[model samples]
Target: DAIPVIHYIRVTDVNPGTMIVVVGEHLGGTQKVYINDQEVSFNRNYVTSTSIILTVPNELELTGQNPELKGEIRIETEHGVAAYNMHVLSPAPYITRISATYPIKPGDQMTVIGGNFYEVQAVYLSTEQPAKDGTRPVDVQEITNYEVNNKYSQITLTAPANLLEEGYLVVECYTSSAVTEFKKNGPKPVVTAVSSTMPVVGSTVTITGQNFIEVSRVNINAEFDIPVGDITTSNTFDEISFVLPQAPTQSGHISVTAIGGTVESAEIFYPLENVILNYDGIGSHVWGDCSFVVADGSSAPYVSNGTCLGITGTVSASNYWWKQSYSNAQWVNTSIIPGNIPIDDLKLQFECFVKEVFTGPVFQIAMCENFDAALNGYVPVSSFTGKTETGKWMQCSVSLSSVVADATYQDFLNRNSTHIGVYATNPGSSQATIEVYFDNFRIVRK
Candidate 1:
């Protein structure tokens, strides 16, 4: 009979407590198996003349305390003994201590503390940005160092060229992975500009900036923490807007702080008075991509000789839209009320002669602060009356109620604001294909 040569090299994978079958000549049924110097029991029916099957020990011996140590096993048959290299690593990798520091800059040398590191490791810097294929872009690197390959107590990690942005660093080995934050140099929060400097109470203000983290706080001239609910930080961390805080009793610059530092705008905030939107030849604004016409009482539905604004675009369609913004819709170049009047007590009253509709509310209306704004201004059509009906002029009156900050439209209506328009589609849909005559558009003082 020949020697019972072990076949560890022929085996693909192995784990503790798992069955290992040996195939060789002269293999006897009474043979014994030893793994990493540890003896393991085998069933009677598990042995054969040409083959022997034995169970690996639950906790086999390791080469050393080294994380990447390798073990070996030997077996004795009736004729001779055979040896083979054995690797019975843990089912999953684990980590304990990790290097902790800040502003992990590129080329920054660091170390990772863990156990069971393998010859091959995948290191990645995870981020919020998406790759070309739409998957979250994980900046990964292949580390090729003997110490890392040897899975020592700790391995040095040289930072990659690409740093993380609001992301973390991940170390993956075999079937195990561990993650740690990459605290890059905190950015300096920036405030490019504001939506409206002169806004009345109960109005929403959008402060355009960067690095608006969840821990960020906004401080008006008064309380630092404004209405919490009214404060909305954009998911992109780019824009932070909120219902104008009622404190301070005066318009003033606001300060915002985030992961980095605090940044504030100029102190030119606050106030406004009555506004006339009619083609009064006084209050004019910029209309971009919006379809409308200015007409005099010479046209139908016009109030005698007074001028009127008409919707000339196809807003009835599902895709037609027009956007026009007003920054100086005041009694522009003129004035009536002081800019300090609270916007809440103000009402946007207007008379319109809507000529067409799909048997529904014709269009929606809103007052905005900036030249390019959304429905955030707070002033909305108070009623959903069928505004498309022909014949008599449709009178619309909307209170600044929707501008509430603390629960109801509370302190939000205190700032001065700008233009309001009939949307081309639903509550401000750009796809508006309808015609309407608008006149007597004014900010009525309550």
Candidate 2:
């Protein structure tokens, strides 16, 4: 007796849970067949002398038989039995949905929907992702709480690591070559530095960073939506522009969150009540007079060329001594504080660039309630001082009480109506010319 002449399997290959058509001479008489030695039921529908179709078992791979599904397809025939090499695969996987799409750092979970998942499965990150090795992405990482879909079918697993860079995730049925499309690594919310770490309330500030999504929420510290929104005018690739929030008494860092990871600024900042007086080009109330002369007004010696108060005076005949005055027409805008200012909280601040490296002048900044027509009435703030720092912008600040030798900086408080001014005594011996650039004059609460 002779059995049927076996040609090949159903299309020579098929996945699990698929109906495989057995095609060969005398195969129509076949009663039953074993896939990888696991018997499955078939209805014998559409049978002919040379072909017979039947469904493979629901899970031959799970039967611990067809691991890679590489085994013999045994046929039970009329005369005798026959075996042929057959290739079985897991399922062809397709993903139509995904949850947990936000940028996942360590301790985050990714919910993957849609499936052709087997009893056993494996997930892999892309070649660019961090791991023991980064390559084909066939590598699988273990995750806890592997959830089987009961409702809409979602698989939630914790993200493997703190992957700061952007990349993808790969899903596969173990050893079956059923890799699916599962991407990862949303844009990371980055925060670098702010334009002014010490800025006043209502001041416009530029925060520098990257990956600034529109829906992102910025936090000045930890509280959300407070001192935020409406004031945040714009967000860009590397910057966020906004009106600085009302300065809280405490200092904190700036934090930003998006669909990507959350990042907090390293440099801490505090919104302050600082009144700047660098002369916004048109005029500077910090300087008392408005005049243009051959003398350089913050020219060449400074980065900014605004209305810097020029200082020139007649040189003493023999001794070469000199003096000049700079004052406001009363402290209208110069008053930075409203209520009584503590002696500790009150401070006069400005940036100054001296023209001469070695020949800098001995300068004095004074405050008064009411002064002469030339803006000089009170005694010098503090007399004994070294040379002004030269060749660069230098910071100058003296306590309110020390400036006027009083117990309270409160002295300079209402003195605004009178004036706060600069008095320079030239140290040079020549024609008594001092080219000094001063900017961002203000009184601040530290």
- Cα lDDT of model 1 by residue, 1-446, tens digit: 67676543433347667777776656664466766566767776866766777777777754433444436666676678877676665545445654634345667766777766553356666754334343434454444332463544466777666565466555565445666554565566888766644332333567877777653478775445675566888887788877654524454567887766788875344322333564555466566444344444365554321455555544433433443333234542224444555556655555555555432224445554432323332222213243334543544556543322212222323335545555544344344445565554555444
Error of 1 at 380 (Å): 40
- What residue runs in model 1 are displaced by over 4 Å at the alpha carbon? 7-11, 29-31, 43-45, 62-72, 94-99, 109-122, 126-139, 142-156, 166-168, 175-446
Candidate 1 lDDT (Cα, whole model)?
A: 0.53
TM-score of each: 0.38, 0.35
Model 2 is weakest, by summed lDDT over 10 consecutive residues, at 375-384
lDDT of 2 by residue, 310-358 (tens): 5443344233224544555223233545455565656655545566543
User: Which clashing pairs does model 2 show?
Assistant: 288-327, 331-416, 381-403
Give the deviation of candidate 2 from the true structure as CA RMSD: 17.9
Each candidate's clash count: 31, 3
The local lDDT score (0 to 100) that residue 203 gets in candidate 1 is: 39
Task: Report how far residue 77 has shifted in candidate 2, in Å.
Answer: 74
